[PDB]
């Protein structure tokens, strides 16, 4: 897809936008790609994850949700309409976007259109609210209402599909086709008005079911099972781990670039024994002030070496001026970039790109000349 390496390398607009966002990567780019003649495809070859992260920072989108349910007022009442909320309204409700296209560039501005829509019966119908004839609505928006109903019909045109017999509730009532039992009472039936017509409370149920079905079906894009469903996984055997086991041999080779006999061993041990019997004079540990001088010189020299090394170890301050130090830093940076590209092409091991290795060697020679 678009996340493949060849797509990231050839996406010139994405590279331009990443340059526009970034500043520290600019100094590497501007002093090497054009000022030093490095090919642009070579520069972005080592920065593929950064390009992928910058692409995925904007390519991802939020999931669908009931955007009109979140829209509520707060005499003056104020409601805040974010641009993402407008996009979610357009995605969840194509009828509103259809009214947006033929009115906003033609007759009135976008906030006027949204204020007309929020005061119309279409917003109440799409929000699940019951429609009453006492409300004025908005005469411009309400022209779409019947068409919206057609859209609802067309919604069923891609929602109705055959289902499995496990959840086939249609076939359950059709299992007995000639059943003529007692009619269910009015508690088991949808509500009716005084004239017998429906009160419309069943339409909002179908409305929210249709909204849920549309949000589920929007996930189905490019972005024998009954036996598996009815099987009881608890009665089956527990899962057995197939993790690999390793036995490590410790027969390593010895490191490469006067054995005492047990008799003299025992004689030396017995010498230590009798030297421990008679007197362990601890005062014999005192040096004769000659070897102590050598020990002191050795220790002080080691201390001097270690202290001169560890006297000094955010970068540290430099004696160079800020003008020359930044020039040295940028020249070091472009030398390191050229060296990285040269080693990548050198250790890649592809003979077809050896001309690029030769060009990078010439660039490294030019960097030596610049140094």
């Amino acid at each position: 897809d678009s996340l493949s390496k060849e797509k990231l390398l050839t996406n010139l607009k994405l590279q331009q936008s990443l340059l526009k966002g970034n500043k520290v990567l600019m100094k590497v780019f501007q002093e090497t790609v054009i000022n030093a003649g490095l090919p642009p495809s070579e520069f972005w070859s080592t920065r593929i994850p950064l390009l992928r992260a910058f692409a995925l920072s904007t390519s991802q989108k939020v999931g669908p949700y009931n955007v009109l349910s979140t829209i509520k007022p707060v005499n003056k009442v104020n409601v805040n309409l974010s641009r993402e909320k407008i996009l979610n309204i357009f995605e969840n409700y194509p009828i509103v976007k259809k009214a947006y296209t033929d009115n906003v560039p033609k007759n009135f501005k976008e906030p006027e259109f949204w204020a007309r829509f929020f005061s119309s019966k279409l917003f109440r119908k799409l929000r699940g609210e019951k429609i009453m004839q006492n409300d004025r609505g908005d005469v411009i928006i309400d022209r779409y209402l019947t068409l919206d109903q057609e859209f609802d019909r067309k919604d069923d045109d891609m929602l109705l599909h055959p289902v499995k017999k496990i959840i086939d509730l249609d076939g359950n009532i059709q299992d007995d086709p000639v059943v003529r039992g007692n009619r269910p009472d009015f508690t088991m039936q949808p509500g009716v008005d005084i004239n017998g017509n429906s009160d419309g409370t069943v339409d909002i149920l179908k409305g929210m079911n249709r909204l849920s079905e549309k949000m589920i079906m929007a996930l189905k894009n490019e972005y024998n099972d009954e036996r598996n469903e009815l099987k009881i996984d608890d009665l089956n055997e527990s899962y057995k781990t197939n993790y690999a086991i390793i036995h490590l041999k410790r027969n390593a080779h010895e490191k490469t670039t006067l054995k005492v006999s047990n008799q003299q061993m025992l004689q030396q041990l017995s010498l230590v024994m009798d030297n421990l019997i008679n007197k362990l004079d601890l005062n014999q540990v005192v040096p004769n002030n000659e070897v102590s001088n050598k020990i002191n010189k050795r220790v002080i020299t080691a201390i001097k070496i270690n202290a001169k090394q560890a006297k000094h170890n955010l970068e540290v301050k430099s004696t160079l001026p800020i003008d020359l130090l930044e020039s040295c830093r940028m020249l070091h940076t472009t030398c390191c970039e050229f060296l990285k590209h040269f080693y990548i092409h050198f250790q890649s091991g592809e003979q077809k790109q050896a001309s690029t290795v030769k060009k990078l060697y010439n660039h490294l020679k030019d960097c030596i000349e610049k140094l």
Binding site: L12, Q16, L19, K20, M26, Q30, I34, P40
Partner: peptide, 21 residues
């Protein structure tokens, strides 16, 4: 001041767009 710096980056954007196209 960074305003002259970002102006130079904008000029460099124009130069790079002219050269690459």
């Amino acid at each position: 001041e960074e305003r002259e710096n970002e102006k130079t980056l904008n000029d460099y954007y124009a130069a790079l767009a002219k050269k690459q196209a």
